[PDB]
Structures are given as C-alpha cells and as structure tokens.
Amino acid sequence: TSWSDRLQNAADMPANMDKHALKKYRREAYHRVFVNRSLAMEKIKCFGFDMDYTLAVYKSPEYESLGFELTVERLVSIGYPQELLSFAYDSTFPTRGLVFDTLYGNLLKVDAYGNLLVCAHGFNFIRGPETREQYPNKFIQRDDTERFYILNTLFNLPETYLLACLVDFFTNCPRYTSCETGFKDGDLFMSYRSMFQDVRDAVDWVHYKGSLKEKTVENLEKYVVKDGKLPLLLSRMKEVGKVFLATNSDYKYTDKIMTYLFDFPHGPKPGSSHRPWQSYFDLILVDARKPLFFGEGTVLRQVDTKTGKLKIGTYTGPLQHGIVYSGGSSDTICDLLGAKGKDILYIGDHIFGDILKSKKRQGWRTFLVIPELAQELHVWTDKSSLFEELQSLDIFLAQRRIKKVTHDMDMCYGMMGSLFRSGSRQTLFASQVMRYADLYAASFINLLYYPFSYLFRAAHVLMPHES
C-alpha cells in the first residue's frame, strides 16, 4: 500500500456534507488540516492553487517508475553504460527532502541546522565515526548551494534513487577506480558533481523534450489520482471568495491534466451539469516560474487557448472572462483580484517554491500539501510504541538501545526513514513545514470538511524564560 493508494481510496468516497458527518470525518488524522499558526478562514478572500502534486497527485510508484525509466534511457542514450538499463525503481529507498553532496557523492538526511542524521554513499549507510572523515563536525553548510542540492519535491524521488544506484554501480564496477570526488576510467574522470548534473539535465529533458508527458496523458487513469470532490470544494470556495490557479506547467499540459481532474458525468455534485475546468477559476496563470514569480517575476503574457501558444507581446489589458495568463508575478494576482497577501491562501506542495517564498517574500497565507502524510500517519500510529519507548529512553538517560530503537523506528518508513524525523531529531523538511506552512495536510481536499468561518488555532508560543 502506497501513500497514493490511501489518497485514491479517500478520493473514491463521495462527499457527505451533513455537518455532523463532516465534523466526525475531519477528526481522523487522514482527513484533518493541521495548524502551525492560527488562521481565521473567514478572512481569506482568495484561494490559490498549484497543479502538479497539489490538484494532480501522481500515483505511486507507477509515476516515479516511469520517470526513472525514461531518465535512465536518456542517460544511456548520451553514453552512460548499458548496465543502467538493469536498474529498476525501488520505492522503499528514497525519502523526500534529502541533500545530495556533489563533492563526495553522498545522500544526506539533515536537520534544520545542517547536522547529519543519515549519510548513504550508494547503498552503503555510513556510521557516525566514519562520517567524520568527510564531515568533521557532522555538519554541512546549507548556504553552500553550489555544493549541496536539496531534493524537495515528489518529482525528485526518481533521481534520489537514481543517484544512489549510480554511485553504487560505479563504486562496484571494476572498469572504474573510485576517488574521493568521483570515478576514473582510464583517461576519463567523472566527478560526482558532473554525474549529478547529467542526472538533473536528464530529468529536465524527459519532462520537457522527452516522452514523459505524452506517456502520462495517454494513460491518465494509471498515473493520476482523480477525485469527484474537487469541483465541490472549488465551487464552495467561489461562493465565499475568488479562486485562482498559478502553476509552473504550460497551458497545453495544464489543460490536459485539469480536464482529466474534472472528467466526471457531473459538475460540483452528482446530478449537476458538467462544467469546464476553467469555469472554476477567476484567474488562470501558467508558466508561473515560481519562486521568481514571488519577486520580479517575468513579463505578463496572454495564452492563445486555441493553439496553446503565447500571443506576441506583453499583455497590458484587464482581467476578462476566458483570459489565460502566462508568466507575470504574484503582484499580477493581487492587483487583478483586489487582494493583499494575508487575504490569500495559497495551496501547493513545493516547500521552497510555493510556501517558503510566498510567505517570506509576500506575506501570503500558506497551505502545504504533503501527499506522503497519509502513509506517514499510518506508520506513526501503527508503530507509536517504538517512539513512545524512545521518549522514555531519552528521559531515563536523564544509549546504544536509543540507536537500536531509532533505527527500528526509522526502518518502518523506508531505508531513508520518515520525511519528518530520524528518531527524536526533526528533519530540515519538518522544520520548514513548521516555520512556513500555516496549515498542512495529506490533501487540500481536507479543507472541504471545515466550515469557511472556521478558526484554525495554534497555541501561543512562549520563550523559555516566559514559561
């Protein structure tokens, strides 16, 4: 059972909008909206959405495996060894939010301070003492973005596993000699940095020049979760405010995916006439280029929706019925919808590009979708006894049993552990969700289960000397 299996099972249920049914439903952790900072829903005037891994959640492991396969094929076509074709995606290895160290070729799981929680070189998990050879303070400088790459989104799961596969392959293939910073084959030297860049380029290529989008659209049921409650939620949002789409995807792909997401024999609820996806939005903006979008952005363009090409010139006109924008900036949305940032709830999955940057640059309210949370919640409750024990062991310490229980707990989630922690230590990703996501949930659809006057409440924070 994957996180997307849980999501599709919930997606298959029709909405029961009886107020007592709703209250009961949202008490289950799977259907709850979690609160880091209080948010009065009554004050939200505009609801904005990302598309990929927000509205359109790709099924796992099918979509990751397709990405993986095509990326490997691209690498082989540019000259990587044929042995790559023997690799197969393994959903049990990668956890999201890992850091690839391009100098030494390690995948790192770190905390908010750059402290190392896990270090894997290929499939070799390095113990603490051995990590000090390369990381003398068991620490990385997060500001060193030329060296370290944070794998933030679900799109990065294939490459997370592929990087490990490659390091493992070159390390153990006798044609190559391993060095601290890469591999030698005769008179050719491949640094881990150059390897990483090829992988990144190949992932970008499959999405933009290769066949990934074509294969996705040709079997949408295989690759994309569909939920009849979506138009219901959006129609309800439009009753109390404005609704917008601001997505990095282009118009043609956005149209294909959105059409599928609304492909039911009804509109908002069973019995109602079907409505085009575009009708649910007061403003539609593609090619957003987030997070640049939340700074200077790019020139505002108009899409010719018949051809899917951009019209020539910068668009200088007003918001009109049926218009679709491309590029621009977050100021485009504020101006055209008559909104200030705190009037906007933006809903997306990219902790950096959707949530951190909209919060820090513009003071938008934020809702982070974390698709894996459904599965993480199952594990968290199902294995609560290991964490409970760890809590008691930590307290009684006021040590090797702590390491053993930490490992056993972490292994329940996968080889790279929970998205949110290693034992008692919170990950960078956890810390960023807390600090920048006002609300978060396994799915944006969980908003459906709360009234629009709801006050999401978080406890006031006190400093140690105030407590």
Ligand X SMILES: Nc1ncnc2c1ncn2[C@@H]1O[C@H](CO)[C@@H](O)[C@H]1O
Binding positions are 50, 52, 142, 152, 200, 204, 213, 247-249, 290, 349, 360, 415, 432, 435-436
CB-based burial label for 320 (10 Å; 0-12, 13-18, 19+): exposed
Asked whether position 53 contacts Mg ion by CB under 5 A, the answer is yes
Min CB(247)–ligand X separation in Å: 19
Asked whether position 366 contacts ligand X by CB under 6 A, the answer is no
User: Which of the choices ligand X, its own copies, Mg ion, none does residue 53 contact, using the CB cut-off of 5 to 8 A by kind?
Assistant: Mg ion
Pick one of 70, 99, 110, 118: the residue that binds ligand X (CB under 6 A): 118
User: Which of the choices its own copies, Mg ion, ligand X, none does residue 32 contact, using the CB cut-off of 5 to 8 A by kind?
Assistant: its own copies
Pick one of 106, 406, 418, 427: the residue that binds ligand X (CB under 6 A): 406
Nearer to its own copies, 54 or 330 (CB): 330
Give the H/E segment covering residue 317. Answer: none
Nearer to its own copies, 34 or 125 (CB): 34
Backbone φ and ψ of 119, nearest 5°: -140, 120
CA within 13 Å, CB half, 154? 24
Binding span for ligand X by CB under 6 A among 138-146, 162-170, 230-238, 459-467 = 138-146
Task: Please report, as a single letter, which amino acid is at residue 105.
Answer: G
Nearer to ligand X, 248 or 406 (CB): 406
Give the H/E segment covering residue 465. Answer: none
Asked whether position 415 contacts ligand X by CB under 6 A, the answer is yes
Is 56 strand, coil or helix? Answer: strand
Nearer to ligand X, 378 or 407 (CB): 407
The one catalytic residue among 12, 18, 50, 255: 50
User: Which of the choices its own copies, Mg ion, ligand X, none does residue 127 contact, using the CB cut-off of 5 to 8 A by kind?
Assistant: ligand X
Min CB(410)–ligand X separation in Å: 6
3-state secondary structure 374-441: HHHHHHHHHCHHHHHHHHHHHHHCCCHHHHHHHHHHHHCCCCCCCCCEECCEECHHHHHHHHHCCEEE
Number of residues lying near ligand X (CB under 6 A) = 16
Nearer to its own copies, 20 or 460 (CB): 460
- Note the Cα 153 to chain centre separation in Å: 4
Is 43 strand, coil or helix? Answer: helix
For residue 50, indicate whether it is catalytic. yes
Task: Please report, as a single letter, which amino acid is at residue 271.
Answer: G
User: Distance from first CA to last CA of the chain, Å, rounded?
Assistant: 43
Neighbouring residues of 20: CB distance < 8 A, sequence distance ≥ 6: none
Min CB(461)–its own copies separation in Å: 6
Asked whether position 102 contacts ligand X by CB under 6 A, the answer is no
The one catalytic residue among 5, 52, 255, 304: 52
| Cα–Cα distance for residue pair 346/139, rounded to 1 Å | 33
Site for Mg ion in 331-390 (CB under 5 A): 349
Backbone φ and ψ of 421, nearest 5°: -170, 160
Nearer to ligand X, 1 or 141 (CB): 141
User: Which of the choices its own copies, ligand X, Mg ion, none does residue 312 contact, using the CB cut-off of 5 to 8 A by kind?
Assistant: none
- Per CB under 8 A, residues contacting its own copies are 29, 32, 34-36, 113-115, 136-139, 141-143, 340-342, 359-363, 373, 377, 380, 391, 394, 398, 420, 424, 426, 430, 433-434, 440, 455, 457-458, 460-461, 463-466
Min CB(290)–Mg ion separation in Å: 9
Nearer to Mg ion, 25 or 53 (CB): 53
Backbone φ and ψ of 245, nearest 5°: -115, 130
Which positions make up the binding site for dATP? 142, 152, 432, 435
* Peptide linkage before 61 cis (omega within 30 of 0): yes
- DSSP per position, 267-308: SSSTTSPP--GGGG-SEEEES--TTGGGTT---EEEEETTTT
Neighbouring residues of 303: CB distance < 8 A, sequence distance ≥ 6: 251, 286, 309, 310, 311, 324, 325, 326
* Peptide linkage before 291 cis (omega within 30 of 0): yes
Residues involved in catalysis: 50, 52
Residues in touch with ligand X (CB under 6 A)? 118, 125, 127, 142-143, 145, 150, 152, 351-352, 403, 406-407, 410, 415, 432
